[PDB]
């Protein structure tokens, strides 16, 4: 029930990309929202905690976005270039590690459908740089799996869960930060039971196999 | 009129601290919102640009916050400690530099009353670490001075300007991110004239003398 102790910081996480996994997609946006478990040790949509750390970045993917990805995210490779965005590089990896290092350990990334998309994509971008070590101290959980267990104790898409719990659609379904903020709200529904589940299911990020690139 | 060329990225910036300058205050929160000038090359409150980078962090100050600072910010040293916040350290300096390095140069920090508070406080925190080099490539402007010139072409507090331009109070006047987002909105009022002023008045950050600490 505590394979790795209590997770100290939950890092709510979302990335947007150029396409689906089969397409060897590249990140176009990412957001990390770090919340100490203290803020979760304790209807209508709750306010976020006062004390949080937030990082939201756009990324030049180096290839075209699919039309569908651009409709969903409002991003395109040309638009990212017009704003001088840089590719996923060593500096970005160092930035992610430095942000994680502001937080008390153990770190647990939390992402909706993260096992199938966000986590293997992040692993793949790091693997292409030879920098999977940037994330090797972290743990991770997929909140689809979590919310299924909490509601059991229907669709489990993020918007489905949000409207089921709060009776309104999430705002800002087109940025990575908006997805992370909606995920936070759903995780605040039954926060103590969520923390028990996270503690029991936290998985070392080093066991996430990359979507593509060296394993 | 172009002493340093066109500024490429405007980094809207705010820090909260334990007290007033006389008290040798310490940072408790900071937010940087990086916007490429493209997003400003072109009533009611406008939406922020789609493509932005955002960094918001809380910081353990190492000393008590004044009661007034805690009323204003909702932060206290004990609350920051309950959430495991770390002091302003080398890792934070590296994080700030890595975030700046995602942006095209020249970088121009933009902060309201920044010449008197935010800029010398940031310089002082870096000076105490021996890391003023983290910010030495940057430029900076104080948006009080900017908005005075734009309106000339009354109080110039952030809230005064906001309600004067948009007929409503800014939301979230208690977090660093809320101040940065309200500052962004005011800078979007006359964006081209703001950019001309910024280009003409941008000041090397190395000329900001620290609020305290080694000069």
Quickly list DSSP for chain B: --BTB---EEEEEEEEESS-GGG---EEEEEEEEEEGGGG----PPPPPSS-EEEEEE-B-SSPPPHHHHHHHS--HHHHHHTTPPBS-HHHHHHHHHHHHTSPSSEEEEETTTTTTHHHHHHHHHHHHT-GGGGTT-EEEEHHHHHHHHHH----SHHHHHHHHHSSPPS--SSHHHHHHHHHHHHTSSHHHHHHHHHHH-EEGGGSPPSSS--
Whether residue A39 contacts residue A185, with contact meaning beta carbons closer than 8 Å, is answered with no
Question: Who contacts A112 (Cβ-Cβ below 8 Å, separation ≥6)?
Answer: A14, A118, A142, A143, A144, A157, A158, A179, A183
What's the CA gap between A83 and A124, in Å, rounded?
25
In a domain, A214, yes or no: no
How many CB contacts within 8 angstroms connect chain A with chain B? Answer: 89
In a domain, B189, yes or no: yes
In a domain, B213, yes or no: no
User: Pick from A19, A88, A26: which is nearest to A57 by CA?
Assistant: A88
The answer to whether B177 contacts chain A (CB < 8 Å) is yes
What distance lies between CA B126 and its chain's CA centroid? 15
What's the CA gap between A133 and A146, in Å, rounded?
26
Interface touch B95/A102, C-beta < 8 Å:
yes
For residue B57, the cross-strand partners are B30
> A203: which DSSP letter?
E
Question: Who contacts B133 (Cβ-Cβ below 8 Å, separation ≥6)?
Answer: none
In a domain, B66, yes or no: yes
Q: Is B179 annotated as a binding residue?
A: yes
Q: Please spell the DSSP secondary structure of A116-173, one letter per residue.
A: TTHHHHHHHHHHHHT-GGGGTT-EEEEHHHHHHHHHH----SHHHHHHHHHSSPPS--
Give yes or no: B174 in active site: yes
CA distances from B25 to B21, B67, B176 (A): 6, 13, 16
When divided into structural domains, chain B yields a total of: 1
Whether residue B29 contacts residue B3, with contact meaning beta carbons closer than 8 Å, is answered with no
In a domain, A213, yes or no: no
User: Pick from B136, B100, B37: which is nearest to A91 by CA?
Assistant: B100
Domain holding B92, by residue range, is 6-208
A56, containing H or E segment? strand A53-58
Whether residue A77 contacts residue A60, with contact meaning beta carbons closer than 8 Å, is answered with yes
Cis peptide bond N-terminal to A106, omega within 30: yes
Q: How far is B196 from chain A (nearest CA, A)?
A: 19
Resolution in Å, one decimal place: 1.8
A28, containing H or E segment? strand A27-36
Which experiment gave this structure?
X-ray
What's the CA gap between A156 and A162, in Å, rounded?
9
The answer to whether B85 contacts chain A (CB < 8 Å) is yes
What's the CA gap between B24 and B124, in Å, rounded?
9
* Coil, helix or strand at residue A57: strand
In a domain, A19, yes or no: yes
In a domain, B214, yes or no: no
Q: Is B213 left (phi over 0), alpha (psi -120 to 50) or beta?
A: left
Interface touch B94/A99, C-beta < 8 Å:
no
In a domain, B122, yes or no: yes
């Amino acid at each position: 029930t505590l394979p790795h102790g209590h997770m100290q910081t939950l890092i709510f996480f979302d990335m947007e990309a150029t396409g689906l996994p089969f397409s060897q997609p590249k990140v176009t946006e990412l957001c990390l929202l770090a919340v100490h478990r203290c803020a979760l040790e304790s209807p209508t949509v709750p306010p976020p905690p006062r004390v949080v750390d937030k990082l939201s970045l756009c990324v030049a993917p180096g290839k075209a976005c699919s039309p569908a990805a651009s409709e969903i995210t409002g991003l395109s490779t040309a638009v990212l270039a017009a704003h001088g965005r840089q590719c996923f590089d060593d500096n970005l990896a160092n930035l992610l590690l430095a942000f994680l290092r502001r937080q008390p350990q153990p770190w647990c990334l939390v992402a909706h459908n993260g096992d199938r998309y966000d986590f293997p994509l992040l692993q793949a971008e790091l693997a292409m740089l030879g920098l999977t070590s940037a994330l090797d101290g972290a743990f991770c959980v997929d909140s689809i799996t979590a919310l299924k267990a909490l509601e059991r104790a229907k669709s489990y898409s993020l918007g489905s869960i949000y409207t089921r719990l709060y009776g309104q659609s999430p705002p800002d379904s087109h940025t990575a930060e908006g997805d992370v903020l909606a995920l936070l709200s759903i995780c605040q529904w039954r926060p103590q039971a969520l923390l028990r589940w996270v503690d029991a299911h936290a998985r070392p990020f080093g066991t996430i196999r990359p979507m593509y690139g060296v394993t």
